[PDB]
Each structure stands twice: as C-alpha cells, then as structure tokens.
Amino acid sequence: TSIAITGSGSCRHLQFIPVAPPGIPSSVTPPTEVPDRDPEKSSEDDVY
C-alpha cells in the first residue's frame, strides 16, 4: 500500500520519500553574550 524511505544514522538531515513537505524551520535567536569582569576597586568611602 505505502512505501516510506527515511534516512537515519549519518542521514539524519535527509528524508528520501517525497511527501511534499513544506516545513521551513525558524532561526535560533541570538543570545546576548555576558562576559563577567571583576576589576579591583578603591574604597567609595574615600568620598565620605
């Protein structure tokens, strides 16, 4: 009745049975890079 030839293993990104798939995946949102910097400080008590 039906034949479904599908990829796997090293063919993960490949499907070979034409089902007419219109699937268009979205794009990964760019996350803001958050580098952490801890330089030394002179005392803010110098102000007082």
Partner: protein
C-alpha cells in the same frame, strides 16, 4: 552680618578645598570614549583597576578641556570670595572690638 560673613568664608573655603581635590583627582585619570559616555580609569600596578563612567558625554575632551578650566575659574572665584568675607570680618572687628 558678622555671623554670615564668617559663614560665607567657611563655605568658600570648603568649596576651594573640594575644587582643588577634584582637580588633583582629574589630573591623574586616563579616560577613553565610550558610547555617548566616557570611561575614565586609573593606572594600577595590578592589571585590575577602578574606573568611572561619565554619561551623556560625546567626547572626553569636554572633561579634559572646559571642565578643568571651569574648576580653575571656580576655585579662583571661591578664593576671592573667601578673601572678601575674611577682610569684611577684619574691618568689622577693626571697628567693633
């Protein structure tokens, strides 16, 4: 009147001291241009250092230019006003004692 002349003298002296200290500070900072701001940090023996952010400043020259000129004018005016208050007190007690 004598009390307020003394108060003006002490306030002008405090202003002189604060202006001189701020100028002495600003003589020893190295500053760089940050987006619509300035980041002025101080050299240190250790690689770490303490910095300061001056916002709403396009170029740090305004901090190294008209700002120190403003400080010099402010301290000159403050010392002149303190001298005026002191000599006002001087004449007051030269006519009062």
């Amino acid at each position: 009147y004598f009390v307020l002349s003394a108060l003006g003298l002490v306030v002008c002296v405090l202003a002189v001291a604060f202006a001189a200290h701020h100028y002495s500070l600003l003589t020893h900072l190295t500053c760089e241009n940050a987006p619509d701001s300035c980041q002025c940090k101080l050299p240190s023996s250790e690689p770490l250092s303490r910095t300061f952010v001056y916002r709403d400043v396009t170029d740090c020259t305004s901090i190294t230019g008209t700002f120190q000129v403003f400080l010099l004018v402010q301290m000159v005016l403050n010392l002149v006003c303190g001298l005026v208050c002191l000599v006002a007190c001087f004449v007051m007690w030269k006519h009062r004692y």
